[PDB]
Structures are given as structure tokens and as C-alpha cells.
Design a protein around this ligand. Sequence first.
Ligand SMILES: [Zn+2]
Ligand SMILES: [Zn+2]
Lengths: 52, 258, 434, 604
Amino acid sequence: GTSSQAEAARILAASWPQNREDEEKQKLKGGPKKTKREKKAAASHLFPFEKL
Amino acid sequence: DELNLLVIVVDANPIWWGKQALKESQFTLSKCIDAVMVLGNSHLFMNRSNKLAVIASHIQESRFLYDGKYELLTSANEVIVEEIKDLMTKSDIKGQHTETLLAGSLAKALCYIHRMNKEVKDNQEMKSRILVIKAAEDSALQYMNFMNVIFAAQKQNILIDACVLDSDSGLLQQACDITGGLYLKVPQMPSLLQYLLWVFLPDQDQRSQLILPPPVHVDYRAACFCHRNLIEIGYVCSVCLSIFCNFSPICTTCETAF
Amino acid sequence: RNLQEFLGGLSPGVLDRLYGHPATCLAVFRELPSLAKNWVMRMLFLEQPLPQAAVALWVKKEFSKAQEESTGLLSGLRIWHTQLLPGGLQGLILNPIFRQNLRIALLGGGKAWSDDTSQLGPDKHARDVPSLDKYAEERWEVVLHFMVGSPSAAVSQDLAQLLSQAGLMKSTEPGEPPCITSAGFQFLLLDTPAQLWYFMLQYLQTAQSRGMDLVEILSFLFQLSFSTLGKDYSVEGMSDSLLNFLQHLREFGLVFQRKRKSRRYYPTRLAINLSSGFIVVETNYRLYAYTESELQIALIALFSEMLYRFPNMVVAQVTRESVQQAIASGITAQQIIHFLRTRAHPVMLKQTPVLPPTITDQIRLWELERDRLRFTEGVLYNQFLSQVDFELLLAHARELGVLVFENSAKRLMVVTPAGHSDVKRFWKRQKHSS
Amino acid sequence: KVDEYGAKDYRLQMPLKDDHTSRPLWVAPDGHIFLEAFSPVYKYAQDFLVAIAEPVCRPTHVHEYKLTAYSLYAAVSVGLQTSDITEYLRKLSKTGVPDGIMQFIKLCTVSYGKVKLVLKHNRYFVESCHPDVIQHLLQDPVIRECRLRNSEGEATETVSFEVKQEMIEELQKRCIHLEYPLLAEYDFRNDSVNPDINIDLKPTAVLRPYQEKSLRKMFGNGRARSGVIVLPCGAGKSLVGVTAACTVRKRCLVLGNSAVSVEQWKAQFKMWSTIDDSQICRFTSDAKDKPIGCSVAISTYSMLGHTTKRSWEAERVMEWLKTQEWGLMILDEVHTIPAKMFRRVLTIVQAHCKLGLTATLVREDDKIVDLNFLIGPKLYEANWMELQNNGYIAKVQCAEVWCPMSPEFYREYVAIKTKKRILLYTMNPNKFRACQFLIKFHERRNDKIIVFADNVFALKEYAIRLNKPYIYGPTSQGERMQILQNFKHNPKINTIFISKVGDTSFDLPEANVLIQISSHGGSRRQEAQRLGRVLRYNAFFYSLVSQDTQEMAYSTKRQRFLVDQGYSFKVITKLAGMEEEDLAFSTKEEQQQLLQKVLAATDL
Ligand SMILES: [Zn+2]
Ligand SMILES: [Zn+2]
């Protein structure tokens, strides 16, 4: 079913550890990036599948 | 955590400033020194961690020049004034040398930047730039050393900014182009401080935000080994890459190399 | 709150009077963004206002957002003001008083910030920089201990009243010592310069209660910020109220003074940083702190389990239970992460980032454990016979702004207990009109 | 000692902090060593502490070591004496040695060489330099049964007596309780009783410096003593054993765990020892390459300790093998030595030096302490962090990524408790989607993947769904061999599934990605071995667990070994591009259909 895909995606993708992380992201990211080196550190500590 | 280091190289050639004083123009060496001091004070005002260094080049050598106003600025200005007075009062013409030892001052500035870099805490990056104000004519006898200094600065990622006053210098244009610095010729000498504050005061990241004059037509004329003169067309060896103005049956450099 | 937030909420007269002191102008200037500083320096020697479009054309189109933010900040700080340029144009020019004072502070002019220091000659009881730092640290530790409530710290009653007004501690019963609230714990966890700035802001917000001039206090504080460490200054030349304020500084350790009647005062390193490592964190949730004072030991034990205490070392383990207890005490995970980053040992500074990501992520996840369940008291409505009737009542509730959750699929809605009465009356009135 | 904050505080005990911080070391009253890695003398302090104490954790900044009686026995086994170790410990203390460590060190080091155990003419003897200790231990009732017939005084030269060969373990266990530890020193330089063989390693098998330290510590003063060397599987482990066998130059016995490890050891000997195939023999009842009359014999456990009737050829081979001494009996996978039947294997054969090698010394049931006297003390423990810093071990980026429990599964998970919930969180649709996404992402970049998964019942539908090769485990011998052989040199297929079969030392080819799902309960050894199958960010391995289930606690409690080794497990809660492509169990229909087939077990 067309609606089954959307329902399953909604349930799975945001079940426990997204209903509070998305809220914090929406209530944050108001100021600009402090330094460009934070992005470098994030890229170095991130796994390859999180870079695409 | 953004640390900016500003090293200002001042062309203190006595001959050019003496000719300027004899011209009785509205611009003198005293005004240039005052503008440099004001620029340094502004750079220190820009951020707490900003560091300032001033080096004056002379025919003799390179001198490390470094009530109601800031205390540190008051101490800094007095030391610079004392150093420049000591250099000029004890400057005695002994020999036929007239060209400014610009290359040696740049080498000293690079060494000082390298020394300061190690003392910086690892959590912070010290972005360093070199500002040069040129008064006398360019010297072609130091082409190789100047190119070596440019290459070292590019390797260490150090911006080099040139502020030509009267006579354009090709070496400074090459340095600005290679290192990504700004080359500017002053149209009105008395307005030098305004140009310095409008162009050379902001850092490279701020230069991205601001709109700046496009670079001037940079030349890349080479210097012949046996003439040390700018040339457009010359003979170049295929082994040691040495440049010669006229054809020779044997390469002089390759003859030396055994 | 930062300095700019406090300054922007002041009246234009206060801002104009603040700019009359050269030290204040420099402090305001150094708080500006990088783009704003270039504009201020360029307009330093301009006697004529500039068109808004001309200034706007200096920055590229992509960075127009930063240009707008800087222009708005400058307008709020009243550094410059819009002038009606002839021909219908708008001209922008800096404040003449602020510009003149900034030029004096930079170029020179007028009299020095301090009256004089050589009039009285050398100090008979002069101290050293390490001694001043030790005195400041002792004063700060005494203040923080008095915040805890230990009998070892004895301070003036006015300091206790100020803390009570700050909300850190409340005196429910007179005579008995006040009890420190959750906000007190949060402030205690805060960094030392941050704590100093928060205390000064709380003092300034209540400065009018003591009948003290805010402008004079701010100017004196800014002058102290730029003062040279290890050099004394003349007390004379100040109003009595400011002198009283200086006495409070002597209580806080910012300014050292041997006697109340002494004419000399030595600014400390804490006073210098007012205008604006020993902890090693390991991947196995271990903290190795090179500290000896009970203050840092207590602060670390607030959010971690202590294991070993060597005479110059503290070995602790960060566990889920300890972090959960600290959060239940009112301290958020972000505060703990910032505290660890600030006290980070210089060795860890090589790592990018300084703190390992795993530990910070684990702490944040432990913080999210407490708020897993969300609680909202209210009244549930489930007796809607018609969809249209449900829609009207839901619209009325949304107009009242008392809706908490809605379900149009099953005609289910929840309203706040306070708004239940209004919804009940509206529903009854609609049936009466039917 | 005081509990003001619940911490054992020893501030008053060790105040000797004269000047000022130059010594990167801290001592503890009971016993413990803390070392600062960010010190110019880090290497020298590490070399000193390794020879005297075993590590307990090696993070990036502050190492922690522990002082034990066996560690001091090993330290005094080397040329280091009491005065040297004490003066160097006091030299680098920065706090002063407490007066509870010096006495312990003295007591441990005084009684080291008093009693020795020797093997001669297939006879075990206990020799004492001081005759008094013989009478001291004579009154012990358990020792009296060792002598037969009562071993009057064995007047030789130095007082010695014979002991029962089959009861050597009991007296070894009792001696440490009597504070008279036994030592197994074999002076292979001068024997003249053993027919030393002509083994000689080729001068082209160079060894890394870390193996040099272990080999040098094994042979401290010209003699070889029993010990345990811990090196990663990806690192060079068999090379150390081959070099030790060549240096001993005696009749070697190698013991493995699986019937394929004997082939691995034979290949290693053929590669790095220059020995003819006639002398090398494997005794595993598969080819029977005339093990009688051999220089080096390689076999496996579970055959030397048979409790049932043995094969006639095997019986004759065992009878021949139990009639001569062995030099440097090599044990592989020593961690599972303290078992009901594996321990007596040590007592069923006679050997001078017992060298045990392993990669994962961690074991449950606290039987590792028994291994201290079963074989010997922990000799060398490789520092994995500095090993991978040299680039010879792959820097594996460990990951611990969990998936939420689907509602269709969590109701049944909380409803059932009679051990039927193992399959439930194992077959989590979200974990299935995460595993499929990781498999596809790493296949798109051409990375070799090994997928470990216990509970082969779940692995069936986990592998047939993606139509990928899997090893059920009792499939065959040939099928597994050919699957693993074509796994490496084939771009078409680069991912396999393993069911608890890869939890030992095999010949699995190089892999970069490991994804383990539903592993054993709390086996730190299993996870360490699985991590060892990847190293040889060059590589990275992932562990998938289900939230709000016992798998969370299991994963937390089974990673404490690797964090002590220095590895950090980053937590991944979101997968980038999860909905970018189509994955299995996209809709709820098949997810709820999975419930019937996962509850269809009903094994009652
Ligand atoms: Zn030429
Ligand atoms: Zn040539």
C-alpha cells in the first residue's frame, strides 16, 4: 500500500531517538559556525556512509 | 581562537626619503611611520590575541622596531619611535650600496613567524601575514633570494601584501600573486593610512566578504645569471635550468658542476 | 547574556553617556563582529554621512546576511545613526562623541585614564603577581564555599542579599542560612569568567536599587578590564558610591587593596578577563585531574564517581548513575561538556575535537534518558457525535490557545485544565443556540 | 581508606612529591601503577613496567598497570633483581612508594628460586637449594600422595624427591598456596640427553621489533621458561612460535583447537622453518603421515584427552608419544585451556617448556588465574594502540549502532520471558534494514564484508532473504573451504555470513567490514576474536543491537575488554540515506507477517 510505506517510515525513522533530537535541532542552530575546523573534525570522526 | 599575526616591513632607505624631503612634498617619512603605528594599533584593537611585529629594512641591515590612549599601545609606540630614531641617527653611508635589503628583512620576518608559531597553543591556529611598504626602486641583484623567500612563504601559507608608494616592483607583484596577497599602488601618498585601513587591515577571511581592487598586471620577467637583469627572451639550460641572455657553447653552471 | 544584549536594552541617553569614556569605547568596539570593526575603522575619519547603498556595496551578495546582522547590531548599539541626506537619500555617520573618544583612545589626547601613580612614589606593601592571583583564587573559593553554605566562609550580609536577589539561594526562614536552588547549582557549574560576568550583570540590573550611577560603574569596570596586571592605580578621582562599589570588588577578589583608606589598588587577572587546563578525559570514561583545591574536587564529584585521590591528582570515573544524579540535581549535559572542554588539559588540545566524541555523545544520550516520558495534565474529550461539531469546538479551543493534542481522525482533543471551563461553557452555549 | 566521597583516598600515605612532576608514575598502597603517556620517558617507563607488571588498561593518555605476585615472579625470572626494581620504582614515583608495596615486593621476590621442578628420564623431580623447605612442605598431606613409593630421600649430590606424574597439577596448585612457587626452566643450551633436531629458520623471515621484545623476554639468561604471549591474530603470532621452536632446537609438540589449525601450523612451519615434510607430522586421524619417529608433531585437543576407546593406530601413536620428553610444547588458543578435559592434557604428556599463545586472554568463570600455575605467568601483552599506530595493524573504527524495536515485535518481546525472546530482537526489522543498508553501501565501494551471526535459525532467513552465501556450520568440510576460497578472489561476491564458526583461529582472508548481529551473551573473548578477524581507517567493524532489550546490556558488558585495549565505540543512532533507496520490510504487511514465522518455532 502507498500509505503503508509512509506509515512505516514515520514509525521507524523517528521512534525513540529522533522525537527529541529533531526538537533540539529546531530549537537550536541559530548562531553561525564557530570555526571551520569543527566541520573537519566531524568529517574525520564520521563514518563513510554518513558523509554522502 | 583565531590568532592573527601582522608583520610590517618598512622600506627605510635613506636616499629615497631624503629625495622626498628635498621635494618638500606633503608626504614625509615621519607621516609614513605615524601611519604604520596607527595601523599596528588598529590591528591590536581588532582582537585581543592579535600579535604585531615591525621590521625596518635599511642599506645596512634589518632592524626589529618591535596620556589618554591605550597603555600597551603607548609602550609599543614609544619603543618603535626609539628604535627608528636609533636606526636613522646612527645610519651612516659607508659604501656604494644603495638598494634596500628587502630580502633579508623578509627572511627575518619568516624566521620570526616560525618562532611564534611554535609558541602558539595547539588548540589555536596562528594565521600570519606580511605587509611590505615599498619606497625605493626594486633591486634585481637579490632575485634568487627573493624567490626563495616567496617559495618558503607559500610553503608555510603566509600572505604577503605589498604597498608600493612611487615605483612599481615586479618582485612584490610576483610575491603577492604567488602567496595570494594584495598588491596596491598608492595614488595619493598623504592618504596612505586610509588605504592601509581600507585594504590591508582586514584578514583574508574578511577579504572574502569585502570587495577589493583587482590585481594589477603582474610581470614575470626572469633575471639572467650573468647580467642579473630582467629579460623577455633568453637561453635556458636543459639540465640545471639556468637562464642566460646570450647563447653559449658550454653552460657555465654545468661547467661548475662536476 | 552577553554585553551586547545588556547594552542594547539601555536607553539612548545611557549609551550616549557611556561613550564619553575612552575605555568604554574600546570595550564596545572589541565586542563588535569582524565585519563591523572594518566599517568602524573605515568611517573613523569621515565627517560626512555615507549612503546606505554605498556601504551595502562593500560586501558581496552572498555575505549580505552578515552585513545586515552587523548593521542591525550597530544600529542597536547606536554607534552610528541614520542622517537625512539632502535629495531624499539616507546618510550613515558614526556618533561624533563615540568617534572622538575612540580616536582619543587610539591616537591620543586628553588626560590619562588613571589620575597618576608616581605622586605617592613606590608602594610600601606591594605584592607580586602570583600573590595577587592566589588572593583572587582564595576570595573566589570563599565566595563559592559560602554559596554551598559551609561555615568556613564568612561574607557580608549584603553579599548574601545580592545572592538571594540573584535567585541562587533563597532564605525561606529568617535567621537560618539560605538554601541553594537548582539555578545555584547551574551557576556553580558555570565557568569562572562566566560566573563573574553573570554576577556583574546581576549587580548592574539591581544597581538602580542602591542609587548608583550605572554609567560610572560600567566605565570604571571597563577601565579595570584594560588595566595592566601588576600595576597599581590611584583611588582618588572617583565618586564615593563608586568607592563603595570598589569595596565590593575587594570582597570579590577582582581588585586587591591592603586597607580601605589606602590610595592604591592592584587589578587582578580576574578583573582583566571580566570584559570577555588540568583535566584529562579518557575514552574509558575516566577523568584524571591535576588539582588540589576542594572546589574542583567537589565540582568533579558533582557529575562523576570519585575513585582515587593522590596528593596532586584525582582519578574519577564518569558513570551513567552519576550523570543521571547530576542531571536530576538540575545540571544539563551541555553545561558538563562545556565545563570539561574549558578545564581540558593542554595535552588533549591536540585532538580535534579536544574531547573524544564518544564520551560527549554518551553524556548527551544519558541526558535524554530523563525526558523519555512527557507529561501534560489536561481534560480529554471523546464524546463528539458529529465531525462538524468537533471541528467548531476544536477551532474555538485553538482560538483560546489551550489545545495540547488533537486527533481529527478519531475526533479526539485535549485542552488545558485552566481552559476546560471556557470550552465547557462554549459547548453548552452552542447547544443552547441549537 | 576514608569515604568522604566514596573514594579510596591515600593523600597522606605518599607525600614524596619533591620536585616536581618529571616522573610520570603514580603508585598505590594496595597495588596499582598509573603512567603518563605524554612524557619524554614514556618508552623507557613502558619497557620497565612491562617486565615487572601486567597492564590493566591502555587508553591514549593514562595507562594503568597492576602489580601481582606472578608479575613479580616473572620480573625476578629475568635478570632484574630486587634492588634494581625497587630503586627504579622509587626513581620514577613522583609520590613516594608506600610502605605496603616494598614489603609485598620483598615477600614475592624472596621465594622464587628456592624450589624448582625438573624432568629427567621421564621422571619428575622437585629440587630445592635449601633443604629446610623440603621438611617444611613434607607435613602437607596432599604432597605425601605424590611420592611413590614414599620416595625416601632421593639422596643426590641439594635435596630432591620424585613426584607422581599424573598429580603434578595438584602440587603446583598447593605450592603457590604455600608461598613457594615452582618454576619451569629448561636449559636447552646443555642437555646432551635429548636428540636435538636440525631445525633452522630461513634468514628471510624478518620479525617486527614488538616480537623481538617478547622473544628476548622469553630467553632472559640463556634458558627458556613456560609463559604466555598475547598477540593479535592479524599480527604475527605463529611466527613467534616458529622462531621459539627453532631457537629451542628440540622435539616440538604443537597443539591446536580445530582440525584445520594443524594445517595452518604445518603451513607456517613449511614457510618459516626449512624443515622436510618427513619430520613434520600431523596427528589428527585424517592422513596419518607416520607420526612415529618425528621431530615436530602437530595435533589438536579433544584427541589427547579422549575418555572413550581410542583407535588402534591412534592408541599406538599415543603410547609412543607418552614415552619421551618434549621440548617447548606449544599450545594455541591457550585461553580455553582451563577446561575439564583440556587441563589433564598437560598432565597426560611430559614436556620441559610449555609455551602458550593466544590473542584474547579474557575468559569468564575466572579460570584465567588457574592458567598462572597450569602453564606459567603472563609474559608479554602487546599494546594494541601503539601496534596500530605503527601501521602494521589496521586501524579499525569500532562502531556500536543500535536500532529501535518495531512495535510489532516489542509487544511480543515484553510478553514472553521463557527464553523465547532471543529470536525476537535478533530478527528486528529495523536491524535487518540497517544491516542491508550497510551491506549495500560497502558493496558499492568494493569492500570485503564478513557478517557474524549466532542463532543459525535466524541466520537462515537472514541470508536467504538477500540471497547471499552463508555457513550454517555443519554444512561440510569442502563446501566451507571452497566458499571461503572464492570469497576473496571474486569481485562478483564479496560478502559472507558466519554462524559462530569464525570464533576461532582460521584462515579467513583479509576483510575490511565486519557486522555482528545477535552474538553470544557476554563473551568478551568472542567479540575480541571477531575484531581480530578484521585487523591484519583502513577497516571498520559495526555491531548491531536492539534498544530496550538485553542486547544493550550484553553489548555494554562485552565491550569492556576492547575499551581497556584502547578502542572506543562510537554510537550511531541515525543512518544517512535510510530512505534514499528501497530496503526490505519497507511496509508493515511483511513486518507483521514476520511475526507468525518468528513465533512459529514453538520448540516445546
Ligand atoms: Zn646572460
Ligand atoms: Zn646548465
